[PDB]
From a paper:
Capsular polysaccharides (CPSs) are major virulence factors that decorate the surfaces of many human bacterial pathogens. Toward understanding this highly conserved interaction, we generated a panel of mouse monoclonal antibodies (MAb) against Streptococcus pneumoniae serotype 3 CPS, determined an X-ray crystal structure of a protective MAb in complex with a hexasaccharide derived from enzymatic hydrolysis of the polysaccharide, and elucidated the structural requirements for this binding interaction.
Toward understanding this conserved interaction, we studied the carbohydrate-binding properties of the mouse MAb 5.6, the heavy chain variable gene segment of which belongs to the murine VH5 family that is homologous to the human VH3 gene family. To elucidate the interactions between MAb 5.6 and its ligand at the structural level, we cocrystallized the antigen-binding fragment (Fab) region of MAb 5.6 with Pn3 hexasaccharide and the structure of the resulting complex was solved at 2.3 Å resolution. Interestingly, the sides of the groove were predominantly populated with hydrophobic amino acids. There are seven aromatic side chains in the pocket around the ligand, two of which (Y66 of the heavy chain and Y110 of the light chain) potentially facilitate the ligand binding through aromatic stackings. We also observed three water bridges between the ligand and backbones of the I58, T109, and G113 residues and the side chain of the R107 residue in the groove.
Residue numbers in the entry:
A (entry chain H): 1 to 9, 11 to 30, 35 to 59, 63 to 72, 74 to 142, 149 to 229
B (entry chain L): 1 to 29, 37 to 57, 65 to 72, 74 to 80, 83 to 229
């Protein structure tokens, strides 16, 4: 029941600041050392901070003097205070639990990640369009022109799991576009309703668009 | 400063075959660690202290090495093992990572399922017209998509996006979008999506007429 839930991510202008948090459950928080590791848009992994038993903190050279890690052993929360951010700091930020019995060091559980973007571009909500056109039919949803990532796409409030996949966003100079597709039996649609629910946290947006026949 | 260089950067294995990946280091390290990241997921620890299996990890996974050279091995490859594999070093200045080995599972060749969609009426009222094509559930990954407008090829304004190997059925999918203004869209009639995959010698075609 070990769980690590990060939050705090978003968009910052260059040189701004932001504070990440990670809420731990299912183990004795205080007994473990903890780390933050980020994954860049190219998918390189990069260690950014540790806090070890006894309270010592360690940082690589490229963040020393700008990041500060700390912990709240009362409510079991890890923090990463980020300041004087730069565009190279754009990444998925993971919080990790450190292995206890090891001759070295390693990270035996990772959260799900919280996304940070550092850019002078402006927050823009998405436009959401339906994709309507055999024994199976394929439907879709076009999510065009938002910033920053990410967007979240579900079908019929999660009721549809199989037959759904979502394509990675593509960035066209300052705006992302992505698409999502679902396949259902011909005898399910149009006689019943298919809706794509899109959420954009950066802009506080949540739309639900019905797919309707032509 | 210790640089870890993994190889090969991409590899592909048939089911039930033995697989080995390597991590060469810029100089000696004390210990090596291996993580597995499946598409859409967080890294997961597999091997710690160069040769120890981490708790919960199937027995077909093995590590070894020493000095500057380390390896991970899967004795009998299975579909759930398709992922990106990273090594990480411990030493006096620890926690640099390799770039990753991406491992795909071989499966039976599958032809793409092709779909094309004309613009939505909502988009048209704002002056825009996106034509979208999905190419779903194919293997192998290599594929080409051609747009034809009124029987002639079109290359400008086209954006592609590809998925990762699906962990469930091990296939690939692809998206292609042709974005025009309403005005350019209404000066032509036939829109066609042309997919060439090794599963077929002639292309798979789908099309619609704007006024049909
Ligand atoms: O956890 C870390 O990120 C840092 O760990 C230190 O090692 C600890 C280890 O974490 C504990 O499990 C064990 O009980 O004690 C060890 C005490 O050393 C590493 O020393 C530290 O590595 C680097 O060390 C350099 C000095 O040797 C320092 O210049 C680096 O900034 C530091 O990263 C590691 O970061």
């Amino acid at each position: 029941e070990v769980k690590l839930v990060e939050s705090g991510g978003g968009l910052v202008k260059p040189g701004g600041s932001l504070k990440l948090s990670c809420a731990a459950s299912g183990f004795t928080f205080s007994n473990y050392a903890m780390s933050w590791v980020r994954q860049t848009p190219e998918k390189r992994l990069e260690w950014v901070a540790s806090i070890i038993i006894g309270g010592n903190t360690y940082y690589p050279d490229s963040v020393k003097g700008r990041f500060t890690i700390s912990r709240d052993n009362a409510r079991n929360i890890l923090y990463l205070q980020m300041s004087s951010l730069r565009s190279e700091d754009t990444a998925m930020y993971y919080c990790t639990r450190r292995v206890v019995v090891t001759k070295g060091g390693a990270m035996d559980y990772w959260g799900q990640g919280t996304s940070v973007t550092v850019s002078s571009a402006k927050t823009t909500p998405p436009s959401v369009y339906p994709l309507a056109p055999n024994s199976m039919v394929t439907l879709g949803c076009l999510v065009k022109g938002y910033f920053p990532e990410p967007v979240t796409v579900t079908w019929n409030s999660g009721s549809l799991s199989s037959g759904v996949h979502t394509f990675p966003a593509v960035l066209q100079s300052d705006l992302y576009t992505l698409s999502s597709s679902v396949t259902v039996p011909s005898s399910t649609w149009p006689s019943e309703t298919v809706t794509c629910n899109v959420a954009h946290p950066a802009s506080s947006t949540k739309v639900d668009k019905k797919i309707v026949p032509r | 400063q210790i640089v870890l260089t993994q190889s090969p950067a991409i590899m592909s294995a048939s089911p039930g075959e033995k697989v080995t990946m390597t991590c060469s280091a810029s100089s000696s390290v004390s210990y090596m660690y291996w993580y597995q990241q499946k598409p859409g997921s967080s890294p997961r620890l597999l091997i710690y202290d160069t040769s120890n299996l981490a708790s919960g990890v199937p027995v077909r996974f093995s590590g070894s090495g020493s000095g500057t050279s380390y390896s991970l091995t899967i004795s009998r490859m299975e579909a759930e093992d398709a992922a990106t594999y990273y090594c990480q070093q411990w030493s006096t200045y620890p926690f640099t990572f390799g770039s990753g080995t991406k491992l795909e599972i071989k499966r039976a060749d599958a032809a793409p399922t092709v779909s094309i969609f004309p613009p939505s009426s909502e988009q048209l009222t704002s002056g825009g017209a996106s034509v979208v094509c999905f190419l779903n559930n194919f293997y192998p990954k290599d594929i080409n998509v051609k747009w034809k407008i009124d029987g002639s090829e079109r290359q400008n304004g086209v954006l592609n996006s590809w998925t990762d190997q699906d962990s469930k059925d091990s296939t690939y999918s692809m998206s292609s979008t042709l974005t025009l203004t309403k005005d350019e869209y209404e000066r032509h009639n036939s829109y066609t999506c042309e997919a060439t995959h090794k599963t077929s010698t002639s292309p798979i075609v789908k099309s619609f007429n704007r006024n049909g």
